Amino acid sequence: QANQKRITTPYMTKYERARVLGTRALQIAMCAPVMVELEGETDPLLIAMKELKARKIPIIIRRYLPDGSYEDWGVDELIISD
Amino acid sequence: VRRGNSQYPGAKYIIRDNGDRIDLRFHPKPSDLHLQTGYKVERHMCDGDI
Amino acid sequence: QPMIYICGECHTENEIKSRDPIRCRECGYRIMYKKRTKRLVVFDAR
Amino acid sequence: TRETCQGMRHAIYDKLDDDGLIAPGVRVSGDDVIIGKTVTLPRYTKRDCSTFLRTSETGIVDQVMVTLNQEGYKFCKIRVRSVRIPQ
Amino acid sequence: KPKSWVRLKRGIYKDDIAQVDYVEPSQNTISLKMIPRIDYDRIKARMSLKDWFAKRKKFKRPPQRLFDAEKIRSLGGDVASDGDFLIFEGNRYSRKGFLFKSFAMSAVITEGVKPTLSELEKFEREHNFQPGDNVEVCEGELINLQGKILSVDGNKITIMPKHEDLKDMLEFPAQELRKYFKMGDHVKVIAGRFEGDTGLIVRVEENFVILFSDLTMHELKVLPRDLQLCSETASGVDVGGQHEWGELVQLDPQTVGVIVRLERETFQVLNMYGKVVTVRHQAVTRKKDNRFAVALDSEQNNIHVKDIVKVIDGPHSGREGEIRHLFRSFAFLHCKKLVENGGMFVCKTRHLVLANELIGQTVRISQGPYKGYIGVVKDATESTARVELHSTCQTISVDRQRLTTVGS
Amino acid sequence: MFYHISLEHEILLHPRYFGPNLLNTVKQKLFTEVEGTCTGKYGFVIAVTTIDNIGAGVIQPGRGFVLYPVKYKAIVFRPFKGEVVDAVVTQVNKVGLFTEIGPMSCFISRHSIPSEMEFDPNSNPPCYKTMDEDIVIQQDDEIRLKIVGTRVDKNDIFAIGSLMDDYLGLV
Numbered sequence: 154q155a156n157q158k159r160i161t162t163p164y165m166t167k168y169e170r171a172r173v174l175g176t177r178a179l180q181i182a183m184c185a186p187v188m189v190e191l192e193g194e195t196d197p198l199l200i201a202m203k204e205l206k207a208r209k210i211p212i213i214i215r216r217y218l219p220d221g222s223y224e225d226w227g228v229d230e231l232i233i234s235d
Numbered sequence: 236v237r238r239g240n241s242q243y244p245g246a247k248y249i250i251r252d253n254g255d256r257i258d259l260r261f262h263p264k265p266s267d268l269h270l271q272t273g274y275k276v277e278r279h280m281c282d283g284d285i
Numbered sequence: 286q287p288m289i290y291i292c293g294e295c296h297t298e299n300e301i302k303s304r305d306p307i308r309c310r311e312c313g314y315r316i317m318y319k320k321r322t323k324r325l326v327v328f329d330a331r
Numbered sequence: 332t333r334e335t336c337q338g339m340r341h342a343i344y345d346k347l348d349d350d351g352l353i354a355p356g357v358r359v360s361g362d363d364v365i366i367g368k369t370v371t372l373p374r375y376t377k378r379d380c381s382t383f384l385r386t387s388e389t390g391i392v393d394q395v396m397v398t399l400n401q402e403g404y405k406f407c408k409i410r411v412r413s414v415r416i417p418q
Numbered sequence: 419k420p421k422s423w424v425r426l427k428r429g430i431y432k433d434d435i436a437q438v439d440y441v442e443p444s445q446n447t448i449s450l451k452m453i454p455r456i457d458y459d460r461i462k463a464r465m466s467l468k469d470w471f472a473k474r475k476k477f478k479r480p481p482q483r484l485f486d487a488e489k490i491r492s493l494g495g496d497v498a499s500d501g502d503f504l505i506f507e508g509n510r511y512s513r514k515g516f517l518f519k520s521f522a523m524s525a526v527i528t529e530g531v532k533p534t535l536s537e538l539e540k541f542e543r544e545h546n547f548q549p550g551d552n553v554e555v556c557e558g559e560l561i562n563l564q565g566k567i568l569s570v571d572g573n574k575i576t577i578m579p580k581h582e583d584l585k586d587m588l589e590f591p592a593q594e595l596r597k598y599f600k601m602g603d604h605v606k607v608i609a610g611r612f613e614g615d616t617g618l619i620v621r622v623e624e625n626f627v628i629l630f631s632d633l634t635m636h637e638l639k640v641l642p643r644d645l646q647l648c649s650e651t652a653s654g655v656d657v658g659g660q661h662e663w664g665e666l667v668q669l670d671p672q673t674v675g676v677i678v679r680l681e682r683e684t685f686q687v688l689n690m691y692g693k694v695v696t697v698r699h700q701a702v703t704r705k706k707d708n709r710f711a712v713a714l715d716s717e718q719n720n721i722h723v724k725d726i727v728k729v730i731d732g733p734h735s736g737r738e739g740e741i742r743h744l745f746r747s748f749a750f751l752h753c754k755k756l757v758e759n760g761g762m763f764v765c766k767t768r769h770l771v772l773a774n775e776l777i778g779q780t781v782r783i784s785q786g787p788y789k790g791y792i793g794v795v796k797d798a799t800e801s802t803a804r805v806e807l808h809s810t811c812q813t814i815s816v817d818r819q820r821l822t823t824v825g826s
Numbered sequence: 827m828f829y830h831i832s833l834e835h836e837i838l839l840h841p842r843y844f845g846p847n848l849l850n851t852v853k854q855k856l857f858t859e860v861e862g863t864c865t866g867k868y869g870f871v872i873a874v875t876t877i878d879n880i881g882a883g884v885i886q887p888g889r890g891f892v893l894y895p896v897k898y899k900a901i902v903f904r905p906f907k908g909e910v911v912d913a914v915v916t917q918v919n920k921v922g923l924f925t926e927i928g929p930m931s932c933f934i935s936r937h938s939i940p941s942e943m944e945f946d947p948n949s950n951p952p953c954y955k956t957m958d959e960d961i962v963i964q965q966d967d968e969i970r971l972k973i974v975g976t977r978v979d980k981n982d983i984f985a986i987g988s989l990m991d992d993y994l995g996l997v
């Protein structure tokens with residue numbers, strides 16, 4: 154499944170949003186370097202949400218197809234609706 | 236952690252990276268109230284919690 | 286040390302010693318009640 | 332006492348009288364001892380098996396009755412009262 | 419059967435191992451030779467046997483010890499000699515010290531009785547075949563063939579050996595089966611002079627196998643049958659749970675050490691000083707572990723147990739370990755990569771570097787919005803107290819400066 | 827026997843290092859991890875030469891850490907039974923001789939020494955010698971020994987050697 158032709162949805166799913174936000178928040182809580190200006194922000198979840206809106210989360214989503222192959226999408230390559 | 240488990244907006248435990256639990260009910264020695272970055276504090280549920 | 290109990294029948298106070306069976310010395314009744322505490326009891330009148 | 336009996340909870344036993352029983356009129360709270368009872372072992376030679384007030388409940392001892400049961404063993408019943416204001 | 423081990427049900431000799439002497443079915447009594455139980459204090463005071471039974475309720479039974487005629491002579495008791503046996507208080511005692519006595523068959527136990535090794539020492543064919551062991555065929559038409567123990571049994575093992583270039587399985591009994599191993603291979607001894615030990619064999623003599631113990635570079639010759647092949651390492655599990663691996667102990671009040679190695683007879687306990695000293699099971703007595711303590715370090719920072727530290731100075735250099743026990747001026751480090759001393763060594767604490775009286779009293783709240791209320795203190799810190807209020811069914815926290823104890 | 831083999835190792839990374847120097851801390855931890863270890867299947871690991879590739883790490887749910895499969899080429903020293911190698915005598919006593927082959931230590935038993943050699947407690951430096959004294963082996967000597975056994979202890983294989991065959995002696 155060459156990422157030349159990724160055939161899955163170009164929109165981030167709601168499940169991907171939920172899990173990416175949680176995982177990044179846990180990383181921030183464990184002193185991972187932050188990717189945006191924190192100005193007056195302290196809650197790891199709020200920081201993770203800021204990073205998501207800025208398209209700065211350093212995470213790749215690996216989507217498995219039923220056939221067994223997978224596609225890798227950078228969190229910044231997907232369209233975030235909600 | 237200074238407030239402890241009796242003043243409501245307080246905390247019940249300190250868990251160190253070693254994994255050992257420090258019980259804040261049986262008021263412990265002030266050396267065991269020390270917090271550093273690895274630790275976690277089991278704080279009381281407060282406003283805005285999900 | 287005294288441990289005064291009230292007899293349920295004849296209402297007689299009488300000493301009782303731990304390990305001593307329960308029995309009124311006057312009437313032989315086997316039910317006794319403890320006396321009210323001497324500790325300070327204070328109520329708000331609410 | 333904590334020198335002889337072993338399994339003593341951290342609850343105070345000073346509310347008990349010398350007969351091992353609480354007296355009427357004493358305020359009590361959850362996890363407070365109201366009947367002190369020990370069983371001799373086969374912190375030495377005695378295991379605490381006291382009766383504690385139910386957790387989360389509170390009240391004042393109303394009356395304390397002492398008798399013998401059918402087989403002649405000492406037997407006590409303790410009534411605890413709790414005023415309930417509608418809320 | 420004659421010369422068999424049995425036990426007793428009731429009486430003062432109960433739970434005492436015994437050996438049979440003769441059995442008389444007609445009389446329903448059997449003779450058991452066992453270690454006598456005689457009280458020396460009774461002989462000194464010269465008490466009658468009947469009196470001892472009258473007051474037996476509060477009297478402790480005597481222990482087990484070999485009979486001595488000289489001991490009673492000093493105590494003044496009368497000792498009589500009847501040939502080989504000796505008569506004392508209407509009982510026949512052997513010269514060695516064993517006690518011969520007759521008891522009813524019903525009282526004696528003759529089923530499910532098994533003596534212990536320690537018990538046998540005081541009183542003083544088999545096969546060892548286990549799955550996964552290579553065995554040879556010493557006798558029979560097919561000689562000089564080595565096979566693996568696929569099956570097991572009792573008197574007739576009936577193993578299914580797998581010989582070289584032989585898929586099929588043969589049939590051989592226990593006596594025909596023999597235990598043989600090739601040179602330079604792991605071998606384990608279940609029974610022997612030093613049982614539960616592992617070593618490698620440089621050669622295999624016809625009947626005297628030679629191996630070298632990992633514990634010490636010394637020869638150990640044992641019967642080949644008692645030998646076994648086991649790729650698994652020697653567990654070295656202790657007997658009775660007297661101590662545990664990596665446990666602090668107090669050999670002497672000044673010196674405290676941690677047991678790093680476990681053996682059948684000896685112990686190799688690592689003391690604070692760092693040297694290795696050998697001791698026995700009985701002499702070493704357990705010491706509790708300091709679940710909480712304090713110490714000092716070069717950096718002048720607090721150090722507790724279970725912290726990763728580096729030995730930048732001291733007996734060891736550039737060494738990393740985990741603290742398991744702490745001493746005033748010493749600390750015990752733990753590891754898994756260190757071969758020497760079972761992975762546990764000791765270094766100085768300083769050289770290591772980072773890598774209630776009011777409870778239960780009755781109080782009156784004398785200030786604040788709860789002034790006048792009265793309660794019992796359930797918990798007090800140095801500044802604040804928990805007061806169960808007599809009137810409100812609530813326990814509140816109150817600054818201790820607002821309390822006055824009510825006196826009787 | 828020294829060998830050059832490619833092995834694989836998964837290194838766990840705390841989110842603390844999810845910074846610009848992440849790939850570097852990955853290899854730093856690999857070096858700290860594998861180097862100096864010993865294993866029965868691959869023998870001693872002497873050094874890490876290169877790192878073939880770092881796989882994409884994975885985020886393990888709930889846990890903060892990220893795991894990386896790091897395939898790496900390393901030098902390993904594995905002896906074998908029936909192998910003749912050079913060794914360095916480090917201590918000599920009446921019981922026998924103790925030698926070293928790289929990290930491994932070896933002990934030569936009396937049954938592995940030719941009959942001509944005999945123990946001599948009287949000598950000041952204990953040594954193995956025969957009456958002719960054609961060949962003398964003492965501490966720091968170079969010997970050629972045949973490996974007769976392998977025994978693994980606390981993730982550290984130890985071997986027993988032999989010099990009983992012809993042409994094995996101080997050259």
Ligand SMILES: [Zn+2]
Pocket residue numbers: 292293294295296297309310311312313314
């Ligand atoms: Zn009465």
